[PDB]
Amino acid sequence: DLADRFAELERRYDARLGVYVPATGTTAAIEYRADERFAFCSTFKAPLVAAVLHQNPLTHLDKLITYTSDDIRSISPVAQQHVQTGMTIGQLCDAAIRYSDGTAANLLLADLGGPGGGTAAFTGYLRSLGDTVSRLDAEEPELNRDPPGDERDTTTPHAIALVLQQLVLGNALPPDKRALLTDWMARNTTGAKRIRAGFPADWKVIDKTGTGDYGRANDIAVVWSPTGVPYVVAVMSDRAGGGYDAEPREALLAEAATCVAGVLALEHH
Template identity: 25%
Template sequence: MKFEFTGKPLLAALTSAAVLAGCASSAIVPQPRAPHAPPPQQQQQPVRSSTGSVTVPIGQPVRSELPAPRGTLDPGFRRPPAGLSDRINGLWRAFPGKTGIAIQRIDGEWEFSERGGDLFPQQSVSKLWVTMAVLDAVDQGRLRLDQMVRIGPDDLAVFHQPLAARVLAEGSVTMSVRDLIETAITHSDNLANDSLLRTVGGPDAVRRFIANKGLGSIRFGPGERLLQSGTAGLTWQQSYSRGRNFQAARAALPDATRKAAMDNYLANPVDGASPSAIASALTRLARGTLLSPESTEYLLGVMSRTKSGPRRLKGGLPPGWQFLHKTGTGQDYKGMTAGYNDIGIATAPDGTRYAIVVMLGNTTSPIPARMSLMQAVSGAVAEFHGR
């Protein structure tokens, strides 16, 4: 394992905190240092690594954009609390399957990870990038939150899409971009997300947003229908969007076809992202450097209302902590799940914020064990906070 000092600007954190006051975020206010005392110097320290642990820093070493903070800071500002990285390493080593973990102090200067640079299937975590691309278009005046979008039977997606029942019952549904964002993020509705994706300009528009913002190792796939059919070994047909037609077609495939498709997906996920890149993106979102102040506040508010995964990372935080997040869960094949994730921003009672990312690339562990791992990770962050 390895950790680095990110050198992110404290002023950006303070500015973001002021903007996001409604989202229970805050930063640390430094005390003045005597004029003769030089500012503390950046340094890097190695942390014990284990065989097989691959950790990649967030891009290249980051140059400080502002002078280093001066005065008395809490001990956890520049480096992880003693023992936290070892605790996370132990949890990571003990859990079967390909696991990635990244933790970053948003109002600080450190990040560490396990397999932080590897690509993991995102699944519904990628809905976050769709919404960000939409809000960026709103910031640029190309879309409006009150813009109406029509959704018809030919737009239906696959798997979790509660909105589909309304479309089928009413023939079509018209919803605002704002309502589609709420539905896509808080309920992880695939139809709402694909409708936003179509409205913003398709997968290429989201990829341009990721590239233009320099988010690093984050891929965006072809959309829910093509992603899921490709993972299963199917060629998409719109009839798969009705009832359980997709599951029936998938079950009729030869086992060799399903296995080859799943193996190919896991080896090179078209929607893959690295835990460190996601943690960095969450930090930048919280600091207000990805979207306008209004869009930042709005998105963090939406993420605070996420309904899915209450027993994943959120379940490990003690009373008084707040958590804004997005989950993602992939298809199962013979007891193995291709992607079981939770990513989010945890805020301590004193306002200190942490980006926490846990991604299970492939695991056969039962769901309670997966949730227990995630709770242990977030619980460790809370336990060691302030040490």
């Protein structure tokens, strides 16, 4: 069975793997270490965007945010490009999702919660969605760097899947705001070798990745069958035996996603 396949993925990669797929009418829940904690890493940026969308009129997306090179202390492929000219809230949401931009995420955190209140405010949005388990404690880049076992900056596969579900497939956002989120995740550039790699090409995939220290590799996704049946997939991993600088393994997540796709696609299941 499925738990055995997942277990062998852990042995071969020298990794801890977490997987959650909520049940549907047709399919049972897929759960493997689903209530164990894993670092968000960049996966937080999906609900971060939902939060800034939710708490503001859409005209707030055209608000220009100015920042300096002092603000860039994490990997920020888009923010670095726009440091001299600024970025609109919309552009930051775009960057946070599609390029995992760390500075963009930090600025969205300050927009939501103020200079020292951002992480508390983000965590609060999640509590407003019924998630009492997840927590964001630090900003980028430190949120990626807690030791294994530290509860700070963690979610679980279970909690982040259900959060994503509400955001994309539920009513947490009104339709015009929900489209924006969904459009950005659909145009993500960092996920091709993760959940995407385990699903056939006629299945639609939108995702938000995460990577960090101790070989952290995450992906959270909404998938659609060719007939448009939706599923939510969260895969999380770390490789803490190699220490702080352990190689993250994207192919661990592609394989877990292949095991999941095998269950969801093959109609004998």
